[PDB]
Design a binder for these strands. Sequence first.
DNA 1: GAGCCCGTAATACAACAGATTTTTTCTCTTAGTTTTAAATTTTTATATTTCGTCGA
Length: 193
Amino acid sequence: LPIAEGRWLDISMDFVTGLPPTSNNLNMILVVVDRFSKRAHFIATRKTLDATQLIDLLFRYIFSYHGFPRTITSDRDVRMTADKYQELTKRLGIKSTMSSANHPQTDGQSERTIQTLNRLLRAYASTNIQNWHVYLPQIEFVYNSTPTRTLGKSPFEIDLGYLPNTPAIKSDDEVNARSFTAVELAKHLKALT
DNA sequence: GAGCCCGTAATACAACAGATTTTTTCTCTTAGTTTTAAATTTTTATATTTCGTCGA
């Protein structure tokens, strides 16, 4: 699919199920992957919270509070083939670009994130049933800070510039400790783009 | 060629592809039922076993 845009104007998301319940939360995987920077957010949820009517859009917007996208790529799921979802996205100026009747490879990068997520979920899933909903933000923070392979830079520092706290600045420069005056961010952030 | 060390660095290969209940015999395990044979008495002559005691 088209390569990249201005910091996740193209985006992907998908669902996987089979997760064990903790508070009647047996979906808990609404993974949204910031395709350009591969920031790859995923927020806990459930099947019965919404069906794209009341609360699904609300945490979709609290994710989208950090920037509206311009293109979705998703599956033929009933939570996104509804008339309510397509029309609201059209009024938002954001395309749908659904899948092709059990062809999840259109959502490949989100599903590849899930494949990376599942291993880390098993790593952090010792307390499988009792209390583990605190681990998804932990898995997010670990996975974003870890450098990938296809780009050589961690997806956290690709968009935000700097790395998270406890600086372990590499031997390139001090440029990854970019937390200072913001009027010159545009030039080098476009260079990183 | 010929190989070796070591230090980087490419490199095909595979996982994400809704998850769960059933379906049909089998095989330990563990608790409830059923039929039946057996623990203490008389007893009667027979015999052998094994104690138990006594004797010069």
